[PDB]
Every structure is written in C-alpha cells, then in structure tokens.
Amino acid sequence: GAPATVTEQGEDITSKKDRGVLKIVKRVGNGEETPMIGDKVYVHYKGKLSNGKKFDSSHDRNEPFVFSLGKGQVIKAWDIGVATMKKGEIAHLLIKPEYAYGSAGSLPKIPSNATLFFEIELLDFKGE
Numbered sequence: 001g002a003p004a005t006v007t008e009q010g011e012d013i014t015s016k017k018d019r020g021v022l023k024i025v026k027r028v029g030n031g032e033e034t035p036m037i038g039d040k041v042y043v044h045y046k047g048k049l050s051n052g053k054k055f056d057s058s059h060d061r062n063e064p065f066v067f068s069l070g071k072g073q074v075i076k077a078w079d080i081g082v083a084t085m086k087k088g089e090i091a092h093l094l095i096k097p098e099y100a101y102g103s104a105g106s107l108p109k110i111p112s113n114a115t116l117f118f119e120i121e122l123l124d125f126k127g128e
C-alpha cells in the first residue's frame with residue numbers, strides 16, 4: 001500500500017540522492033512558498049514503523065504537532081521533508097534510518113536501524 005507506492009513512485013528529496021527520504025504529494029497545497037529554516041510549523045501526522053508494530057498520530061493527542069523547522073526538534077527527514085511542503089499539502093514520506101533514529105534507535109519506541117513512514121498534513125507555518 002501507501003509505503004510501497006512511495007518506494008515505487010517517491011521523489012528522492014535528499015541532497016546526497018541516497019533515497020534516504022522519499023516523498024509523494026497526495027493532496028496539493030497552495031501558495032508558492034514553502035517553510036524556511038526557523039519557521040514555527042503546525043502539522044497533523046500519522047506515523048508508523050516499517051515493522052508494523054507501532055503507530056502514532058497527532059490526532060491521538062487531539063491537537064496539532066508544532067515544531068520549529070531546522071531547529072533540530074524532529075528527525076532530519078522531517079526538517080528536509082516539511083521544508084518541501086506547501087500550506088494544506090498532504091505528503092507521504094518513507095525514511096531510511098540515517099534520516100531518523102539511526103543505528104542506536106530510540107528504544108523502546110524505535111528499534112535500531114528502523115525505516116519509518118509518515119503521512120503529513122502541513123496546516124500552517126509562521127515566521128519567528
């Protein structure tokens with residue numbers, strides 16, 4: 001399903017072109033402008049491990065997920081991926097461990113060398 005489609009049709013959005021972060025736009029946003037480093041960013045997301053054993057949604061907390069882009073509050077793949085998104089965009093991201101929690105992982109929630117999948121909705125973003 002959705003992750004396999006991302007393997008298949010995903011744009012490689014890494015600078016190194018190592019397929020570390022793959023993206024499909026599933027619903028198009030609006031506005032020419034994507035977030036810049038520093039912006040306060042508001043999203044909804046659904047995330048899971050490739051192993052299918054953990055799922056997490058912003059909705060589980062009945063409130064948006066907020067973070068400052070590029071300010072190392074989230075995994076590298078989010079800083080890279082959300083910078084490509086427009087307001088109102090829903091995107092799918094498939095992420096190799098190098099752009100997530102690496103060989104150490106983040107036990108027990110994230111195992112060593114985990115691939116992650118996210119659906120992200122970019123709700124809004126404002127300047128510092």
Ligand SMILES: COc1cc2cc(OC)c1OCC/C=C\CCOC(=O)[C@@H]1CCCCN1C(=O)[C@H]2C1CCCCC1
Pocket residue numbers: 045047048049054055056065073074075078106109110116
């Ligand atoms: C291991 O840390 C978590 C990871 C995720 C959610 C968390 O709690 C809601 C987590 O615990 C509290 C810290 C919350 C977020 C810290 C960093 O998380 C992140 O950078 C990415 C991107 C932003 C949404 C959350 N996220 C996560 O890695 C989630 C994962 C939870 C397990 C399934 C894969 C998603």
